[PDB]
Amino acid sequence: ATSTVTGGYAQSDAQGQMNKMGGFNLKYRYEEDNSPLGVIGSFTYTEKSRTASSGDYNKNQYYGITAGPAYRINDWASIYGVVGVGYGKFQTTEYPTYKHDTSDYGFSYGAGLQFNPMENVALDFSYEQSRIRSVDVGTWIAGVGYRF
């Protein structure tokens, strides 16, 4: 069988919210010997950056799990599409009790292309968009991997 390892970096911007985040992703790929199917699973970890001025500090973390099939044609290039779910958590203040979700969640999807399918180095570039109740987030992901 064949295995491919890829890693990448992404930056996200929140339209309608004021904040920017940075995260990293690790990808695992599995292929079948007699009937290959392209599958990628990626785990993303992003953190919010802090700026010195007001003096207030807030801890915000976001984790996302995604998976996507991939199609190869004319042995030239391969394309894939992914969907996943992400959750975000922030420091809590003591508020009166009411029915509501403890953490925020949203859905993400996108597609990517593979370039330079020669040697042990290949590049992956994809566009990511996600909706987190009424807030729009855009993330660009690029990374490099090797197959053996």
Swiss-Prot record:
Gene3D superfamilies: 2.40.160.20. Belongs to the outer membrane OOP (TC 1.B.6) superfamily. OmpX family. Keywords: Cell outer membrane, Membrane, Signal, Transmembrane, Transmembrane beta strand. It comes from Escherichia coli (strain K12). Residues 13-21, 47-62, 87-106, 131-137 are extracellular. It comes from the Bacteria. The gene is ompX. The chain crosses the membrane at residues 3-12, 22-31, 37-46, 63-72, 77-86, 107-116, 121-130, 138-147. Its main location: membrane. One of its GO terms (cellular component) is host outer membrane. It is found in: Cell outer membrane. Residues 1-2, 32-36, 73-76, 117-120, 148 are periplasmic. It is a multi-pass membrane protein. This is Outer membrane protein X.
